[PDB]
Design a protein around this nucleic acid. Structure first.
Ligand SMILES: [Mg+2]
Ligand SMILES: [Zn+2]
Ligand SMILES: [Zn+2]
Lengths: 79, 1343, 49, 98
RNA sequence: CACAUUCCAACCACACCUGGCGUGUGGC
DNA sequence: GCCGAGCAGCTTGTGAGCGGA
DNA sequence: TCCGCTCACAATGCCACACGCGCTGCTCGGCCGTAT
C-alpha cells in the first residue's frame, strides 16, 4: 500500500524515466524471476519496485550496469 | 517501430514487385467447385491458403506435404494471415492515370501539365480526345484536338496523323512530358510576368511542381501502370467488373480491331478504373441492389462511420465497468470503494492466474467453474489480487486532467461504487445519481504508471492553477466552523487546561462544552532555517474546539492558522500552507484526518435549519410601505405631467433597488444580533448561533445572495429583453409568494436554465477545437537558451488591482534578470525558478514589471523547452521535458467554460455610455506619470490635452503604478505633469456630444479657403441665436464643391500664419465634411477652448465581452462588424477621390510615397484631422479591433498581451482563475504559420506561406553564410484554419473536412515528421509524451 | 404557427448593415408558403418555398 | 454493468455495449484527451489496441495473464498494415521511415 | 521405377448465435 | 426469346458567378 | 478590365424523411459453375 511517492520525484529528475526504470525493474523481477533486496509485506511487484526506487539502491545507471555485467558474465560462462 | 511518415508517388515497378500473382479471371468465385482458382478473385497465389497450414481443396491438413504444391491446386501450405496482408494485381487493358486527381480543387492532373481541367477531362473522358504524333502537321507537341479537327486533318495527313483516347492517351501524354524543361519554362515565365491573378496562379503552380521535381516523383508515375487487387476480407464486385471489361478488351482488341473499337474499349476500362478510384467523382452512380450504391475505397470517412477518424481514435473498450456513485466517507483518500460483483467480473483472468499459480485450480475449465460457482475460498484470491492493483475512476464528461484518476479499490457490498467525498468536487460529480466508469490498467507498465502519475495523492494541485483542487467541501467546513465558533458562555467558562488530550477527554465526557474560551498549553514546532522543527511550549487562550483540532494538524504549521472561525477560505488557505511548508507526503493524511474530524463533529453537532431559524425583519414591512408610497408619489408626479416615462421608470427602478438593499442590510444586521447571552454579566451580544447563518457565513453551502432572497425580499426580475420590470417581488420564501410573483420568477429562471443547458451542450465543441489546435507539441528540449521574453506587470487597467504581480509571475522563469530599483542589483539573476519566497522578495523590492520567459520566446523548433515554459502547476518544481503541455492547456482552458453565460443582459453599455463622465478620479496619492505627453497651458491658465493616446498613471509611494486612466481626444486636465495631487476627486472633463477643435496657442482665426453655398450652408441656432454654419460633406455637396476642403487657418494676433514652436510649418485646423461652425471668423479665440463642434456618434454599443461567444471569436480571430481600423504606414493622411461606392482615403509617410489605399464607410467618422502627422498603428475608428492588424503592425508581444488581457478580463468577470501559460501556448500555436515578405538570396519567394519554424531552420544553414536567410512576418489566423494548415497530414486527415483534407493530403506528396500526438493515436503507436517519450529517445540513442 | 400571416423584423446588426429589415410570411394550413422580404436596399422581394 | 472478455460484433472485431448482454463501456474522445494530458503511453496503447483492436493481441494478452506473465505484446495492428497497403495501392508510396 | 496428401492406451482439436445499427435522399 | 435483377405497391471556408466603378 | 459582393456548394456540424438489416409480382437488360 503506497500512498506518497513525492520523495521519488525528489530522487529522479521526473516521473517519466522514473516509471520507465520502475517498469524495467518490475519486468526483471516479477516476469524475470530474479530476487529483490527489500523486505516485502506480502504484496505485488509494483509497490516493492516503488519502495526500492525510493530507497536508492536501484536506479537507471545501477540497472544498466547490472544488466551489462550480467550479460558479460553470461557470455563468459558461454565461452 | 516507425519514423515520420511521408506520402507521395514513387517507383511503380517496386509497387508491382511488392506483390505477386494475377487475378485476370473475371469470374467472382467458383463457389460450385472447391479447387484454388489460380486466377479467380478469391485466389491463393495472390493471398494464400483458405486456413492456417491447410490446403484450399480440403485434401491435406498435416505438415508433411508442405514444400510442394498439389497436382492442380497450387496452394503452398502456410499461414492464412498473409491473406489479410498480401496483394496481387487485376490484369490491365489500358494504363489509366486517375479520376480522383480532378475534383481536388483544382485538378492534380491538369495543373501539373499546363492543361486546364476541362481539357484533361475531355481527354480522359469521351468528349474530345488528344491527337499525338502529328508529323508534318503544324500542331504543337502537347496540343489537344477534337474529333472534328482530327477528322478533317486526317485528309491532308492520312496515317501520319493519329490520336489516342482516355487511358493510353493520357499515358502517352504524361510519358512524352519532360517536366524539368516545363518547370524551367514556368520559372522563367514567373520571373518575366508581372500581374496579380496570373502571378498567384503561376507561383502556386511552380511551387507544386518544384515540390514534385525535387522529390522522388515522375510524371509517368502518375499513370497507374499496374492496378493491385483487394483481398476478399475487405469494391470487390467493382474490380470484378473491371477485370470483366479487361477480358472484353482482350477478346475484342487482340483481333486487330479498328481504332474506334479499341478507343471505346480503352475508354470503358478507363471509366472502370475511375469507378475504382471514386463512385461519384467520375460521373456515374452505380447501384448494388434496389437503388443502393456501393463504395469506392471510401464513402464518408468522417463522422462516426469513417475509419481514419472514428474507429482509429474512439471506440469501445473491454474490461470496463460502469455503475453509480455513493459517498464513502470512511475510506482513505488514496483508496476507493468497489462492489464485490464488479471486482469479481472485471478481474476473472487475474483470478484464473492466481488460482493456476497455486493448486486451487489447475486447468482453465475447472478454474472458470470454481469462479462462477463463487465458493467462499476464492474470496481471499480476489482480495489479494486487488491489494496493490489500482484501477481508474472516470467521470462521463471529462474536461480537465482530473476527469480520470487512479484509486486502490477495496471490496464492499451493494452494486454502488463508493467514492471519497474529498475528490468528487474535482470530478464535478454530485451524488444526485451520477454514473461513472472504472477501467483496469491490465499491464504491469500500466499499473506502475497509474500508481505513479494519475494517482489520487499525486494530483492535488489543479492543472489550471497552483491552488489545491482538493479543497474541502461543505460538510467538513461547516462542522469545523461550528467547532471553532466560540461563544461567550458555556460549560467550563474560562477554565484552564494543560493539553489537547485533556480537552478531548473533557468534551467526550460531557463536562465542558465544545466552544468556550479557555487557557490551554500548546507544544508547537517552528520551522527552522534547515529541515528541522524547533519545539516550543506556550499557554494559549483559545476555545476548546481549536485545541481539539490541534491534535490533527502536523507539527509544522503554527497555532495562528487554527485560531480563526475556519471558513471555506480559511480552511483552503490552511491546506495550502500545509502543502507549501510540509510538502506533499503529510498533506494527504492531514486532509484525510481533517475530513474525518469534520464529519464526526458535524454529526455530533446537530446542525439543522427550521421555520423559526430565518427571522423576518420587523422594519421590512415599514420599508416596503415607504417604498411603495414613494413610487406611488413618483407615478402621480408623472401622471400630473412633470416627467417623462423613461426618467420616472429609472426613478422607480433605483428606488426599489435602494429599498431592497436597505431591507437586505437590515435583515443581515438582525441575523447576527439578538443572540444575547449572560456570561457572568447582563448583556454579551456576540456572533449569532443561528443555523442558517452558520451555514452561510462559513461559506460551506450558502451564499449572501441566496440567504438574502430567502429571508428578505427577492429583488428585481426582468423579461428576456433584460428590462427590469417595475413590479419587484415584495415577498420572501419564508412567506407565501403571490401568483404573479412566482410567475415572474419562473419567467426569469427558465431563460437561465435554457442558457445553462445550451452552453453546457456547446462547450464541448470549443473544447474539441482547443484540443486539436494545440495537440501537436510536446516539451522536447530542456532549455532553448535564449534572451527574449515578455514584460509582466500587475493588472491595474481600470480598478486598483485586478490581478497582482505575484500570481501573474509565480510559476515561471524570468527571461531577463530582474533589477532592483537600486542600480546594479541582480538579486534575481537570469534563468531562475520562482517560489513563494522569491515572489515575496519581488514584492518587497517594489518591482513593477519583470521580463519573464514565454513559450513564444522559446526558439526551439517543433516544441517548447521546459526552461522557458514555467512550473508544472501540479507538482511544486520545474516542469520536465516530454509532457504534452498543449493538451493540459486546452483542458484547463475548456474546463471552466461551464461558468460562461452567453448573453443575459451584459452589453457593456447597460447603465450608460457617455464621455461627459470621463472625468478622471483616483484614490491613492503619489507621482503622476503621463504617456504621449501633449499638455499645453492655454491662454486661460488651464492645461489642455492635444492628444488621444495620452494615458495617466499613478506611481505609488514606492515606485509602482496602481491606477491608469485614458484621456479623451483633446480633453482638459486641471492638473499637470508630476503634480502630487491627492485622490478622491474628478479633475478632468470632456464633451461626448461632439469633438472640439481646441487650440494650443492664442491669436485669431478666419474662414480661410471657405465659401457659403458651395461647401458650407447657412443655418441658425434655435437656442442662442448666432448662425451655425454647416460645412457640407461628400454626400450633400455638388460637383463645383467636390474639389474643396475648407479649414480654419489659425493666425497670430496680427493675422499672419502661425509659427509653431519647434518646427517651421504653420498648423491650421482642418474642417472635414459635416462640420458645425459656431465661433465664426474674426473672433478672439481663447486658447484651449471648443470652437467648431464637429459632430460624432456617441451612442454605439455592441460589447459582448461578458459571454462565451466573445472568447470563441477571440480564439477564432474573426473579423468584427465594425473593426477598429489602424494606420498601415506612418506620416500624414491625405484625402483624395471619393464616392466610388464609398469614401476613400490615402496615407503617406515622410520616408516614402503613398502606396496605401483605404476605404471608409460614410457611417464611420475619423479620429484625427489631416494636419496631424500621426504614427502608424494608431486608432482610426473607435470600436472592436482585429488581431491581424494588431500582430502585423504592433509586434508579437502586443497581440498576445492584448489577447491574454481580454481573456483574463472575461474569466475574472465570470469569476474563473486561469494561469496565463495555457493561453500563452494556445496563442503561440495560433500563429505557427508566417509569410515571406522579401525573397532575398533564399530558395523561396514572398508568395509562399511557409511555417515559421521551417523558415527558421532554413535560416539555420544560411546563418553560417552571409546570404540573407528570409524575411518572415507572423499572421495569426483562425484556429480551425491553423489546425487545417497542419504540416502533418495524418493528424490533418482524421480532422474535420475529411474529404477536402484527405484529398489535399494524399495528393500533396510531402513529408510530415508526426512530431505530435494525433498521428500516434492514428497508427496506435506509443505517444511521445509520457512514459513513451523517453522510451522513444531510448530507441533514438543508437539509431 | 397559426395558419395566416406574420411580420418578422431582422433587428440588431443582421446582414452587417445596422438596419432592421422586415419580412411578411404567409403560411396556409397545408400548401405552399409565401414571403415578402426587404433588403439593405429599398427593393422588396418575394420568395416561395 | 461490467464486462471481462466476451463476444465481438460481426462487422467490427470490437466489444459491444448494452447492459442486457455482456458488454463493456464506450471510450469517448474527451477521456482520450484527458489521458493524453497525463503520461500513460503504455496504458493508452492498451486501452486502444490491445483491449479493443488486436483480435490476436487480446487473446495473447489473456494467455500471458493466466500464466502470470504480466507483460504486454506490442502487436502492431493488422488494420494499420491494411490501411498502409490501401495507401500504397491508391498509387501513393508509403514513405514510412524508421 | 518415381511424387506421395494414412480408414483420423489416457487426451489436448470439434468453443459462441444478436445488438440495435446501417444505406440512400433532402436541409441550412 | 430465356434467365437474372431492380423497382414499385404501399458555422467556416472556398470556387464560381454577378455586378461595379 | 480587375475589384467588391454574394451564392452554390464542400464540408465542422448535426437534423428530417424513404428504406433495409428477414416484403412479392412485374419489366428491362444481359446469360456454358478434377487433374468445367
Ligand atoms: Mg449530478
Ligand atoms: Zn490441394
Ligand atoms: Zn525556451
Amino acid at each position: 500500500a503506497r500512498v506518497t511517492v513525492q520523495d521519488a520525484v525528489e530522487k529522479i529528475g521526473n516521473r517519466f524515466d522514473l516509471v520507465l526504470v520502475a517498469a524495467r525493474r518490475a519486468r526483471q523481477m516479477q516476469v524475470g524471476g530474479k530476487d529483490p533486496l527489500v523486505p516485502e509485506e506480502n504484496d505485488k511487484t509494483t509497490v516493492i519496485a516503488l519502495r526500492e526506487i525510493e530507497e536508492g539502491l536501484i536506479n537507471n545507471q545501477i540497472l544498466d550496469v547490472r544488466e551489462r555485467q550480467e550479460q558479460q558474465e553470461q557470455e563468459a560462462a558461454e565461452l | 517501430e516507425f519514423d515520420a511518415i511521408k506520402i507521395a508517388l514513387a517507383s511503380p515497378d517496386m509497387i508491382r514487385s511488392w506483390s505477386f500473382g494475377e487475378v485476370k479471371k473475371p469470374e467472382t468465385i467458383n463457389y460450385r467447385t472447391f479447387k484454388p482458382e489460380r486466377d479467380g478473385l478469391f485466389c491463393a497465389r495472390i493471398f494464400g491458403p483458405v486456413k492456417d497450414y491447410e490446403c484450399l481443396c480440403g485434401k491435406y491438413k498435416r505438415l508433411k506435404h508442405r514444400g510442394v504444391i498439389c497436382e492442380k491446386c497450387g496452394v503452398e501450405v502456410t499461414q492464412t494471415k498473409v491473406r489479410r496482408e498480401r496483394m496481387g494485381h487485376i490484369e490491365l487493358a489500358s494504363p489509366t492515370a486517375h479520376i480522383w486527381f480532378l475534383k481536388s480543387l483544382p485538378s492534380r492532373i491538369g495543373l501539373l501539365l499546363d492543361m486546364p481541367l476541362r481539357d484533361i477531362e475531355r481527354v480522359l473522358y469521351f468528349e474530345s480526345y488528344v491527337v499525338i504524333e502529328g508529323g508534318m502537321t503544324n500542331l504543337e507537341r502537347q496540343q489537344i484536338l477534337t474529333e472534328e479537327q482530327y477528322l478533317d486533318a486526317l485528309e491532308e495527313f492520312g496515317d501520319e496523323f493519329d490520336a489516342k483516347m482516355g487511358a493510353e492517351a493520357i499515358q502517352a501524354l504524361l510519358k512524352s512530358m519532360d517536366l524539368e524543361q516545363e518547370c524551367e519554362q514556368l520559372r522563367e515565365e514567373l520571373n518575366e510576368t508581372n500581374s496579380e491573378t496570373k502571378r498567384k496562379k503561376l507561383t502556386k503552380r511552380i511551387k507544386l511542381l518544384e515540390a514534385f521535381v525535387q522529390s522522388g516523383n515522375k510524371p509517368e508515375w502518375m499513370i497507374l501502370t499496374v492496378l493491385p487487387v483487394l483481398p476478399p476480407d475487405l469494391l470487390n464486385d467493382l474490380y470484378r467488373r473491371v477485370i470483366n471489361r479487361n477480358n472484353r478488351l482482350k477478346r475484342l482488341l487482340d483481333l486487330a480491331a479498328p481504332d474506334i473499337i479499341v478507343r471505346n474499349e480503352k475508354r470503358m476500362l478507363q471509366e472502370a478504373v475511375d469507378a475504382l478510384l471514386d463512385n461519384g467523382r467520375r460521373g456515374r452512380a452505380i447501384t448494388g441492389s434496389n437503388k443502393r450504391p456501393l463504395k469506392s475505397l471510401a464513402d464518408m470517412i468522417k463522422g462516426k462511420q469513417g475509419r481514419f477518424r472514428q474507429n482509429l481514435l474512439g471506440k469501445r473498450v473491454d474490461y470496463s465497468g460502469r455503475s453509480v456513485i455513493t459517498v464513502g466517507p470512511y475510506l482513505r483518500l488514496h483508496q476507493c470503494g468497489l462492489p464485490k460483483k464488479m471486482a469479481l467480473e472485471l478481474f476473472k483472468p487475474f483470478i484464473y492466474g492466481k488460482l493456476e499459480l497455486r493448486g486451487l485450480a489447475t486447468t482453465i475449465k475447472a478454474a472458470k467453474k470454481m469462479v462462477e460457482r463463487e465458493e467462499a475460498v476464492v474470496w481471499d484470491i480476489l482480495d489479494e489480487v486487488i491489494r496493490e492493483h489500482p484501477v481508474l475512476l472516470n467521470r462521463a464528461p471529462t474536461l480537465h486532467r482530473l476527469g480520470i484518476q487512479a484509486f486502490e479499490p477495496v471490496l464492499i457490498e451493494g452494486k454502488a461504487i463508493q467514492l471519497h467525498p474529498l475528490v468528487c468536487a474535482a470530478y464535478n460529480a454530485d451524488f444526485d445519481g451520477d454514473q461513472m466508469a472504472v477501467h483496469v490498467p491490465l499491464t504491469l507498465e500500466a499499473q506502475l504508471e497509474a500508481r505513479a502519475l494519475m494517482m489520487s495523492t499525486n494530483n492535488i494541485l489543479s492543472p489550471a492553477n497552483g491552488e489545491p483542487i482538493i479543497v474541502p467541501s461543505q460538510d467538513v467546513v461547516l462542522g469545523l466552523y461550528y467547532m471553532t465558533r466560540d461563544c461567550v458562555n458555556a460549560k467550563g467558562e474560562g477554565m484552564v487546561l494543560t493539553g489537547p488530550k485533556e480537552a478531548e477527554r473533557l468534551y467526550r465526557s460531557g463536562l465542558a462544552s465544545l466552544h468556550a474560551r479557555v487557557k490551554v498549553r500548546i507544544t508547537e514546532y517552528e520551522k527552522d532555517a534547515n529541515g528541522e522543527l524547533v519545539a516550543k511550549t506556550s499557554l494559549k487562550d483559545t476555545t476548546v474546539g481549536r485545541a481539539i483540532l490541534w491534535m490533527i494538524v502536523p507539527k509544522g504549521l503554527p497555532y495562528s492558522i487554527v485560531n480563526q472561525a475556519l471558513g471555506k477560505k480559511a480552511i483552503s488557505k490552511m491546506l495550502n500552507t500545509c502543502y507549501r511548508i510540509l510538502g506533499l507526503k503529510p498533506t494527504v493524511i492531514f486532509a484525510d484526518q481533517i475530513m474525518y474530524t469534520g464529519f464526526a463533529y458535524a454529526a455530533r453537532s446537530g446542525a439543522s435549519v427550521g421555520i423559526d431559524d430565518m427571522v423576518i425583519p420587523e422594519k421590512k414591512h415599514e420599508i416596503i410601505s415607504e417604498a411603495e408610497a414613494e413610487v406611488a408619489e413618483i407615478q402621480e408626479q408623472f401622471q400630473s405631467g412633470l416627467v417623462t416615462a423613461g426618467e420616472r421608470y429609472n426613478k422607480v427602478i433605483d428606488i426599489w433597488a435602494a429599498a431592497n438593499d436597505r431591507v437586505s442590510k437590515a435583515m443581515m444586521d438582525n441575523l447576527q444580533t439578538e443572540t444575547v447571552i449572560n456570561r457572568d454579566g447582563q448583556e454579551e451580544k456576540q456572533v449569532s448561533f443561528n443555523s442558517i447563518y452558520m451555514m452561510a457565513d462559513s461559506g460551506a453551502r450558502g451564499s449572501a445572495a441566496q440567504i438574502r432572497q430567502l429571508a428578505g425580499m427577492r429583488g428585481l426580475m426582468a423579461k428576456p429583453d433584460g428590462s427590469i420590470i417595475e413590479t419587484p417581488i415584495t415577498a420572501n420564501f419564508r412567506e407565501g409568494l403571490n401568483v404573479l410573483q412566482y410567475f415572474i420568477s419562473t419567467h426569469g429562471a427558465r431563460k437561465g436554465l435554457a442558457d445553462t443547458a445550451l452552453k453546457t451542450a456547446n462547450s464541448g465543441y470549443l473544447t474539441r477545437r482547443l484540443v486539436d489546435v494545440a495537440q501537436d507539441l510536446v516539451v522536447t528540449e530542456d532549455d532553448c537558451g535564449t534572451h527574449e521574453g515578455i514584460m509582466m506587470t500587475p493588472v491595474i487597467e481600470g480598478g486598483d488591482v485586478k490581478e497582482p504581480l505575484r500570481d501573474r509571475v509565480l510559476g515561471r522563469v524570468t527571461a531577463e534578470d530582474v533589477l532592483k530599483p537600486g542600480t546594479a542589483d541582480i538579486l534575481v539573476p537570469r534563468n531562475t525558478l520562482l517560489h513563494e519566497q522569491w515572489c515575496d522578495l519581488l514584492e518587497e523590492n517594489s518591482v513593477d514589471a519583470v521580463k519573464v520567459r514565454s513559450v513564444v520566446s522559446c526558439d526551439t523548433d517543433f516544441g517548447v523547452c521546459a526552461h522557458c515554459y514555467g512550473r508544472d502547476l501540479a507538482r511544486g518544481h520545474i516542469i520536465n521535458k516530454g509532457e504534452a503541455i498543449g493538451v493540459i492547456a486546452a483542458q484547463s482552458i475548456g474546463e471552466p467554460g461551464t461558468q460562461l453565460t452567453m448573453r443575459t443582459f451584459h452589453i457593456g453599455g447597460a447603465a450608460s455610455r457617455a464621455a461627459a463622465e470621463s472625468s478622471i478620479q483616483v484614490k491613492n496619492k503619489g507621482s503622476i506619470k503621463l504617456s504621449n505627453v501633449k499638455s499645453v497651458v492655454n491662454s486661460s491658465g488651464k492645461l489642455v490635452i492635444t492628444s488621444r493616446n495620452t494615458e495617466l498613471k499613478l506611481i505609488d509611494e514606492f515606485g509602482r503604478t496602481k491606477e491608469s486612466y485614458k484621456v479623451p481626444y483633446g480633453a482638459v486636465l486641471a492638473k499637470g505633469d508630476g503634480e502630487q495631487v491627492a485622490g478622491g476627486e474628478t479633475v478632468a472633463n470632456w464633451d461626448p456630444h461632439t469633438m472640439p477643435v481646441i487650440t494650443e496657442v492664442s491669436g485669431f482665426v478666419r474662414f480661410t479657403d471657405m465659401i457659403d453655398g458651395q461647401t458650407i450652408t447657412r443655418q441658425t441656432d434655435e437656442l442662442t441665436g448666432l448662425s451655425s454654419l454647416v460645412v457640407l460633406d461628400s454626400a450633400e455637396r455638388t460637383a463645383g464643391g467636390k474639389d474643396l476642403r475648407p479649414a480654419l487657418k489659425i493666425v497670430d494676433a496680427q493675422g499672419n500664419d502661425v509659427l509653431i514652436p519647434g518646427t517651421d510649418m504653420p498648423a491650421q485646423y482642418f474642417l472635414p465634411g459635416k462640420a458645425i461652425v459656431q465661433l465664426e471668423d474674426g473672433v478672439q479665440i481663447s486658447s484651449g477652448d471648443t470652437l467648431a463642434r464637429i459632430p460624432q456618434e456617441s451612442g454605439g454599443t455592441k460589447d459582448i465581452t461578458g459571454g462565451l461567444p466573445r472568447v470563441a471569436d477571440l480564439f477564432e480571430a474573426r473579423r468584427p462588424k465594425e473593426p477598429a481600423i489602424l494606420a498601415e504606414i506612418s506620416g500624414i493622411v491625405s484625402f483624395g477621390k471619393e464616392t466610388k461606392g464609398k469614401r476613400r482615403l490615402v496615407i503617406t509617410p515622410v520616408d516614402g510615397s503613398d502606396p496605401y489605399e483605404e476605404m471608409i464607410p460614410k457611417w464611420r467618422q475619423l479620429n484625427v484631422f489631416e494636419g496631424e502627422r500621426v504614427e502608424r498603428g494608431d486608432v482610426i475608428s473607435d470600436g472592436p479591433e482585429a488581431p491581424h492588424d494588431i500582430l502585423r503592425l504592433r509586434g508579437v508581444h502586443a497581440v498576445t498581451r492584448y489577447i491574454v488581457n481580454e481573456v483574463q478580463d472575461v474569466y475574472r468577470l465570470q469569476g474563473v482563475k486561469i494561469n496565463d501559460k495555457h493561453i500563452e501556448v494556445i496563442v503561440r500555436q495560433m500563429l505557427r504559420k508566417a509569410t515571406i515578405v522579401n525573397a532575398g538570396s533564399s530558395d523561396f519567394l514572398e508568395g509562399e506561406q511557409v511555417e515559421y519554424s521551417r523558415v527558421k531552420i532554413a535560416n539555420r544553414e544560411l546563418e553560417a553564410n552571409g546570404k540573407v536567410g528570409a524575411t518572415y512576418s507572423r499572421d495569426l489566423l483562425g484556429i480551425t484554419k491553423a489546425s487545417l494548415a497542419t504540416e502533418s497530414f495524418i493528424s490533418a486527415a482524421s480532422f474535420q473536412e475529411t474529404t477536402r483534407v484527405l484529398t489535399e493530403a494524399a495528393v500533396a506528396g510531402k513529408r510530415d515528421e508526426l512530431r505530435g500526438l494525433k498521428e500516434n493515436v492514428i497508427v496506435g503507436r506509443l505517444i511521445p509524451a509520457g512514459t513513451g517519450y523517453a522510451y522513444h529517445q531510448d530507441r533514438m540513442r543508437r539509431r | 404557427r397559426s395558419p395566416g400571416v406574420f411580420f418578422d423584423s431582422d433587428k440588431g446588426k443582421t446582414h452587417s448593415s445596422g438596419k432592421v429589415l422586415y419580412n411578411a410570411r404567409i403560411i396556409p394550413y397545408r400548401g405552399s408558403w409565401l414571403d415578402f422580404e426587404f433588403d439593405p436596399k429599398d427593393n422588396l422581394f418575394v420568395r416561395i418555398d | 454493468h461490467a464486462r471481462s472478455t466476451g463476444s465481438y460484433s460481426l462487422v467490427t472485431q470490437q466489444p459491444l455495449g448494452g447492459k442486457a448482454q455482456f458488454g463493456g463501456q464506450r471510450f469517448g474522445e474527451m477521456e482520450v484527451w484527458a489521458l493524453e494530458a497525463y503520461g500513460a503511453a503504455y496504458t493508452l496503447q492498451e486501452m486502444l489496441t490491445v483491449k479493443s483492436d488486436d483480435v490476436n493481441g487480446r487473446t495473447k494478452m489473456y494467455k500471458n495473464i493466466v500464466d502470470g506473465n504480466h507483460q504486454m505484446e506490442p502487436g502492431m495492428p493488422e488494420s494499420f498494415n491494411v490501411l498502409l497497403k490501401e495507401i500504397r495501392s491508391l498509387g501513393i508510396n508509403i514513405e514510412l521511415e524508421d
